[PDB]
Structure formats: structure tokens, C-alpha cells
């Protein structure tokens, strides 16, 4: 019910050591540096439907103040994809879910792409491991 | 640390049917399907909380806010605490609130827009 992917994202984040939860658009929350952040969740069936076709091979990259990376990626890091700024919808973290069959050949095992502010990248990396 | 009272407020809100939690405005509450920060203040006497004249007037509406025990102009000290946040929860010793009907010791200062959603979550 769309909530399926929000719950999947919350479980993947809790598995990586984050304090994350769901709240009924349907929104997700995450604790970074001791602060709560809204996470917008978008699911698309193909990389073309998510405007990620050219992006997949370029991850992780920093563009327009945002770091764009696969959820499952700690590797060291321009305009941003078409509907992504529109999908952020006032929030500062965006989580895009594609079928794993499309992301896995580029190293995205879970299917998730995270669009995080570059100011939050330090706190994000220091929550894991 | 005053986390003791934030936990007490979260339990009282969950008991009344609300989805409330403390952040690891440290308190959050779900109203109409939206998350709201709740500012928590604990004071030892009604004078320290600017509630002396208020206790007998609850529940009242004042300056766009519905002031009531958890179960006209607002004090300028409450207008500073409620600024930033939207909901303010003031905790006094129950010995002061109980003769006025406040068994728990908590006073909630909620916006008028949120009163509909608050009443429909009980």
C-alpha cells in the first residue's frame, strides 16, 4: 500500500544502526546527529520512471548541495534529476526505491537511492558501524 | 534531567489514545495524521509557571489557544514557551492542580486549529 516500502526503508535503516520510524503524504523519520529529519519516499518501477537512467552509473555524486548514493554505499563521492526536487516536497532527505534488478548491477543491492544534504553526510556516516 | 516528566506526558497521552513519543521540544504527538512538537515545562508552584490566576479558569480559550487540564491575553511567559513549538505542556505539582480538577498536574496549551483533531483521538 506504498507503506510497504516505507516499512522496508525503516527496517533497512534500523539494521544499519539508525533510529528510524514511520508516521502516517505517508512519511518516514530518521535521527541524524541527535536531530529528527523527515524522509520522503518514492517508488518507481523502472529507472526511466524515476529519471535515474543516467544517474545509476554516477553514484555516489554530490549535486546542488545534495549527496546522491545507494543506501548500501560508503564509498567516497554536476542540475539534479527532473522530478526529484519536486519529490522532496519541503523535506531535505529523499529515498527513491527502484527494483533491485536495476540497481544491483551498479552496486545498489537494496534498490534504494538516498538524496541527502551534504551538511547531513557527516552525521549519516557516523550512525553506521 | 527533566526527561522524567516528558516520559510521564508520553505515557498519559498514549493512555488517552494518542500516538506520542520522546525523541532519542523533545516530545512528539500525532494529531489528524500529522506530527507535532510538544514543548514540556515543569514548575514547582503555579506562580513559577504564571498559572495562579489561570487554574480556576480552565478550560478556557485564549489568544487562539485552548488551555485545559490534560484529563482574556495568555501569560506572556507561556507566549514565549509556546513560540517556536505549537503545543505547550506545563506540569505543576498535583497538590496545586487537583483542587481545580487537574488530577495529573498537566496543563495543555493547544492551537484552535488542532482542537478538533485532539478531541477526535481520545
Numbering used by the authors:
A (entry chain B): 5 to 28, 38 to 90, 98, 100 to 150
B (entry chain A): 5 to 28, 39 to 85, 98, 100 to 149
Article passage:
The enzyme, termed Hjc_15-6, is encoded in the genome of phage Tth15-6, which infects Thermus thermophilus. Holliday junction-resolving enzymes are nucleases that cleave four-way DNA–Holliday junctions (Hjs) into two unconnected DNA duplexes.
The production of selenium-derivatized Hjc_15-6 using 0.5 l defined (mAT) medium supplemented with SeMet resulted in a total of approximately 0.8 mg protein after nickel-affinity purification. After solvent flattening the mean figure of merit (FOM) was 0.59, and after automatic model building R work and R free were 0.33 and 0.34, respectively. Hj-resolving enzymes have so far been reported to function as dimers; however, both the DLS and PISA results in this study suggest that Hjc_15-6 may occur as a dimer of homodimers. Based on the observations above, we may conclude that Hjc_15-6 has a typical archaeal endonuclease fold and a dimer organization that resembles those of other archaeal Hj-resolving enzymes.
